[PDB]
Amino acid sequence: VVGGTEAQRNSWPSQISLQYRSGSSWAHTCGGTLIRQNWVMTAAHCVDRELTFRVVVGEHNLNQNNGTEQYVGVQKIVVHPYWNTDDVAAGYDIALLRLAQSVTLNSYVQLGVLPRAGTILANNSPCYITGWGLTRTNGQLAQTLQQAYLPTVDYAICSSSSYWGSTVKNSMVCAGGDGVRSGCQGDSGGPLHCLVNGQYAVHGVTSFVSRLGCNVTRKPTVFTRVSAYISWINNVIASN
Ligand SMILES: [Ca+2]
Numbered sequence: 001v002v003g004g005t006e007a008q009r010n011s012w013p014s015q016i017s018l019q020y021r022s023g024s025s026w027a028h029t030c031g032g033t034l035i036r037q038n039w040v041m042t043a044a045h046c047v048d049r050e051l052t053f054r055v056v057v058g059e060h061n062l063n064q065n066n067g068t069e070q071y072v073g074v075q076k077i078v079v080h081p082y083w084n085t086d087d088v089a090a091g092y093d094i095a096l097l098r099l100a101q102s103v104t105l106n107s108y109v110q111l112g113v114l115p116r117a118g119t120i121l122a123n124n125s126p127c128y129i130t131g132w133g134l135t136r137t138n139g140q141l142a143q144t145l146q147q148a149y150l151p152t153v154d155y156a157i158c159s160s161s162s163y164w165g166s167t168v169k170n171s172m173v174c175a176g177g178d179g180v181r182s183g184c185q186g187d188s189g190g191p192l193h194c195l196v197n198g199q200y201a202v203h204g205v206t207s208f209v210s211r212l213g214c215n216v217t218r219k220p221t222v223f224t225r226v227s228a229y230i231s232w233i234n235n236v237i238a239s240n
Pocket residue numbers: 059060061062063064065066069
């Protein structure tokens with residue numbers, strides 16, 4: 001997250017670290033949201049390479065013991081049928097991961113709340129992006145969970161010529177674009193948490209930033225809009 005503050009150890013308990021095995025080590029690649037005791041939601045592009053993946057829950061500092069972490073293997077990946085690797089701009093950037101164990105829920109490990117289907121956030125709705133991703137463009141991953149305040153930019157404005165124009169679809173949410181604060185490389189698959197009726201719900205899955213840089217004036221971070229995919233998520237969980 002560029003222009004972020006460090007998150008409190010227990011403020012975002014559905015945030016997971018998606019990691020893959022590199023050599024003998026494991027390495028963070030993406031975020032995700034625990035949505036069931038045995039199911040994670042992440043971006044489809046995060047599971048495009050055929051790697052061994054694990055999900056870590058109760059995670060705060062990647063490279064120090066925290067006393068909270070449960071480490072569970074991935075048993076099944078269900079990416080969206082319509083996802084296409086060569087066209088992130090088409091949308092559909094969402095995947096569900098079935099875990100090989102239900103995890104123990106506790107104050108560090110909780111299920112993320114999903115919105116209703118059809119829900120559109122109004123322009124400038126308050127939302128937080130969370131993750132361990134890069135802190136500068138071409139920078140370095142954060143050791144500790146970071147968060148940034150990222151108000152929504154509605155469709156009309158985000159699909160306007162000077163912002164993203166045609167790249168953003170109605171199945172996406174745009175947030176940020178002030179030139180200072182953004183998602184960045186590493187944060188993908190993770191949540192955008194927005195306040196609705198006094199409750200935080202995960203409204204976005206981090207999909208992309210600009211190739212010019214993570215924090216660009218007039219180019220907001222773009223997220224898969226979870227509300228468009230509610231039936232799909234439930235249909236997958238009822239059959240796997
Ligand atoms: Ca740790």
